[PDB]
């Protein structure tokens, strides 16, 4: 049996529940591919359980060898774990008059 809405409000009142306030607080704010590949690096398949760094890199206890594609995938994943990708590269790319001319001249002139 599901609880009633008045019973739920009274339960909030008698319990001191801050979950509804947490949801409102987290919701409400400020309302005013590649260019190349390599065939040898695709067909390459490397051992895993030879060295402790690749013992970190793996995903399965029973797996002992994996191809170069999944190898470089886990390699870039642990590279991501070491250095997280920031916004200026992840989400920023360059590719009447304007208004940021002062900003451009300020960036180009000392």
């Amino acid at each position: 049996p599901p609880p009633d809405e008045e019973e739920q409000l009274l339960a909030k009142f008698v319990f001191g529940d801050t979950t509804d306030l947490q949801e409102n607080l987290a919701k409400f704010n400020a309302d005013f591919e590649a260019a190349w590949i390599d065939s040898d690096d695709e067909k390459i398949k490397v051992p895993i359980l030879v060295t402790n760094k690749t013992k970190k890199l793996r995903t399965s206890y029973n797996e002992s060898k994996i191809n170069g594609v999944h190898y470089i995938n886990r390699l870039r994943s642990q590279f991501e774990k070491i250095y997280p990708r920031p916004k200026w590269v992840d989400d920023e790319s360059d590719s009447n008059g304007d208004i940021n001319a002062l900003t451009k001249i300020l960036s180009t002139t000392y």
């Binding site: 260019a35 690096d41 470089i72 870039r76 590269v89 360059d94 180009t108």
Partner: protein, 427 residues
């Protein structure tokens, strides 16, 4: 011409020459390999104390320098010297008549480059071996693929790939197959520096002009670029301490810190090195530290520090400027006059042609200090006759010094160039 009485030991009062240093770590301690002419030195980094020297003078000057964990890779006239703690213990002769220009280490493949665009790939004799002794293959980049080799880089997560940044474009060679696996687009500005970013597959190319372009090899695309005109980018480094900041050391002795997320200029540093000696000849962040080692060609190796942000809320917006931290240096000119200071053979005064006189320590060089040029006040209280601006004293052509009553009155007399008078100095 070897001797039976004496034997050469080392050089005092030189911390750099213009050759870019190489940083390395032995776990938590960090050491810096910087060339001194025919020789290299290895300093500590937490204290800038000296760690190692090259024991054997190479018959020529070392041109290229690099280092992995416990093995330093020098390149003087034709060969790659592989030393351990400066001890000459492996020589690697390339099969050319040219001079080794570039050098880089990745795994089981050493990549050198002699000046006729000739890359040399050497394979380790064993995966457990420590230095390359076996000649793997020899590549060469002819004039159609790109310009002269600017850099031999090894980008992260690349199976036997080598980034040969040339003057015109960027090449990617698979050194296992010996094949050029990618040719980048031609860039309108001649690349002078290349440095791998901490982000994936992206290099920074600091060209003849100010245009630090963030290029991605995966997209084959210049993602970003920073305008900074009338300046030759001589070094690029990345803050790996935890903030998206880039240091650009121009050849004008300047250092520019950019914040990349706000796309703004954090800070500038003017005349950290002398332009006539090349300005900033190398600038490298400490990996995971807000400490920046800046070496110039002016016989100078500085180590600045970034303070953490004082703003409780803002932080990297209100980020701290660089604070002056520890440096090493010597004369820019050869030393003209030298003198010892005491019987213990612990200090030497050295006057050079740059009109700057320096007390160098002898046991450990952490006491290499320029003698202060700051006048005591006259006994009559009258004015002094001279220019309002300051200047150094002429080069020292004669000198005497005693230590009978040291710390009592003057103990050094220096006859400068073409003076009818000799200046006094307190040691």
């Amino acid at each position: 011409k070897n001797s039976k009485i004496f034997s050469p030991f080392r050089i005092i009062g030189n911390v750099s020459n213009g050759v870019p240093f190489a940083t390395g770590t032995l776990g938590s301690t960090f050491y810096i390999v910087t060339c001194v002419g025919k020789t290299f030195q290895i300093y500590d980094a937490n204290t800038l104390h000296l760690l190692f020297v090259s024991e054997k003078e190479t018959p020529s000057s070392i041109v290229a320098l690099s280092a992995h964990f416990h093995y330093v890779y020098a390149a003087y006239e034709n060969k790659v010297g592989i030393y351990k703690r400066g001890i000459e213990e492996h020589l690697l002769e390339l099969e050319t008549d040219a001079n080794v220009e570039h050098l880089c280490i990745f795994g089981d493949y050493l990549c050198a480059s002699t000046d006729d665009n000739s890359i040399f790939i050497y394979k380790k004799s064993d995966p457990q071996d420590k230095y390359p002794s076996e000649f793997y293959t020899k590549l060469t980049v002819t004039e159609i693929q790109g310009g002269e080799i600017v850099s031999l880089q090894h980008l992260a997560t690349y199976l036997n790939k080598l980034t040969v940044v040339t003057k015109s474009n960027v090449l990617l060679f698979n050194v296992r197959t010996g094949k050029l696996v990618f040719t980048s687009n031609e860039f309108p500005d001649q690349i002078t520096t290349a440095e791998p970013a901490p982000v994936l597959d992206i290099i920074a190319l600091g060209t003849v002009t100010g245009e630090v372009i963030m290029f991605n090899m995966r997209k084959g695309k210049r993602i970003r670029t920073i305008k900074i005109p009338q300046s030759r980018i001589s070094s690029l480094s990345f803050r790996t301490d935890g903030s998206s900041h880039l240091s650009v050391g121009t050849s004008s002795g300047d250092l520019i810190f950019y914040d990349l997320d706000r796309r703004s200029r954090i800070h500038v540093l003017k005349n950290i090195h002398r332009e006539s000696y090349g300005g900033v000849t190398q600038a490298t962040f400490l990996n995971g530290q807000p400490i920046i080692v800046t070496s110039g060609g002016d016989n100078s190796l500085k180590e600045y520090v970034f303070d953490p942000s004082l703003s409780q809320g803002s932080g990297d917006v209100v980020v701290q400027p660089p604070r002056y931290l520890r440096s090493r240096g010597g004369h820019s000119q050869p030393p003209s006059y030298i003198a010892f200071a005491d019987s213990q053979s612990h200090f030497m005064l050295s006057a050079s042609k740059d009109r700057s006189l320096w007390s160098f320590s002898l046991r450990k060089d952490a006491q290499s200090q320029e003698m202060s040029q700051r006048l005591h006040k006259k006994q009559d209280g009258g004015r002094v006759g001279g220019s309002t601006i300051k200047s150094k004293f002429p080069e020292i052509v004669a000198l005497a010094i005693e230590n009978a009553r040291i710390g009592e009155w003057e103990n050094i007399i220096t006859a400068h160039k073409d003076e009818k008078f000799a200046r006094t100095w307190d040691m």
